[PDB]
Amino acid sequence: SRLIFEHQRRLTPPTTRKGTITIEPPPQLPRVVPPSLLRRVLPMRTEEVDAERADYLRYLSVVRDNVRAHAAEQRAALEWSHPEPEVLATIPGTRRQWERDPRDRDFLVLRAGRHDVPLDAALKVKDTADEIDLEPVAHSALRGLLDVQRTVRDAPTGLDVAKLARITVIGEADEARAAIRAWIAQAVTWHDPTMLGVALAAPDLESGDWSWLKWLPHVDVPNEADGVGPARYLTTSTAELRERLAPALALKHLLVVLDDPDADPDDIARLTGVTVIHRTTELPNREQYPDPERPILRVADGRIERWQVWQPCVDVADAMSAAEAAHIARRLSRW
């Protein structure tokens, strides 16, 4: 029925030299004596301090170039490991499909869009002064540097799921199912179908809606045919999906999604990593400062605005379409 895949090694994109770039503090406002016309009318004065200013600014330029190289490495890696939700149509073929392993820094991380990643490198200066006054035209430059070259511009974000255990989106219907299908495909595509599992419950499953999990062998079961479908956990009842997963519930990671806002949300959990996803109708208003785990997510036009006290947390969201996911499943069912 299906072909065979062999565990060819993963390729390595050049990682980050995650060190501690250090910057020398500027000079210390050298005291300038009065010009004194008497000894200035013949035809440690400004010339020397200007020379020193120029030297420090040159040094600063060099450091800026180096940190930009580091930023280039970082964006290169992050683009390599979370491509845009169209290239993934071509990935199921080549030797990079199950290229994610539990030893690798990117594991069970699900891309959702592009915004400012804070440049994991250090950027620490060794300031040792007790409010001594530093030269104005150097300190100004260093300060104006340490704020714009510290955060990478729009970069592939990460909605990691290895330490969330619950995701609950809020907002319009299909805008939600978009980001959901998006990162759920991005998840299944990179990791061995023998390593992580997914579950579904929805009323109109086979209508161009959640049907598309048909050809999915990530939703599979061990030792069961179900006639045509791998496991076809794809259902409409909640506790029924639980029972279909009750033996599978026990590490193969589990990803249970629920297109139903009602029908007893939070009824399996609340375990040790098995993640639940549930689209909700409406929000809490005074949540007790939601834990970074099991958080709240609102879907704007192109934002995925987190819930904190609105901290958009994504400025351009990654959205998928239904038919695209359909063609994804179709292509991937081959190997």
Binding site: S1, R2, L3, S211, K214, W215, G227, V228, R330, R331, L332, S333, R334
Partner: protein, 78 residues
């Protein structure tokens, strides 16, 4: 033993499962009653298959695109 393929009508491709080693004289009414002169199955922009060929020898596997169009007058158009 069974393969689920994307079968075309005039679009509205269907999601159907078919045997692996069966002649097509019987799938042709099967597909004419599932999604819908003689037709035949083929890959998109690929030469139609022999109506008594087997789906496992001509190389059809889960995820493929199988179409419904009339039968040519013999040459394969290489």
């Amino acid at each position: 033993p069974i393969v689920r393929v994307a079968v075309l009508a005039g679009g509205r491709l269907t999601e159907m499962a078919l045997p692996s080693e069966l002649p097509l004289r019987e799938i042709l009414p099967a597909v004419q009653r599932i999604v819908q002169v003689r037709l035949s199955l083929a890959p998109i922009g690929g030469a139609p298959f022999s109506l008594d060929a087997t789906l496992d020898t001509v190389g059809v596997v889960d995820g493929d695109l199988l179409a419904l169009q009339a039968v040519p007058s013999g040459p394969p158009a290489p």
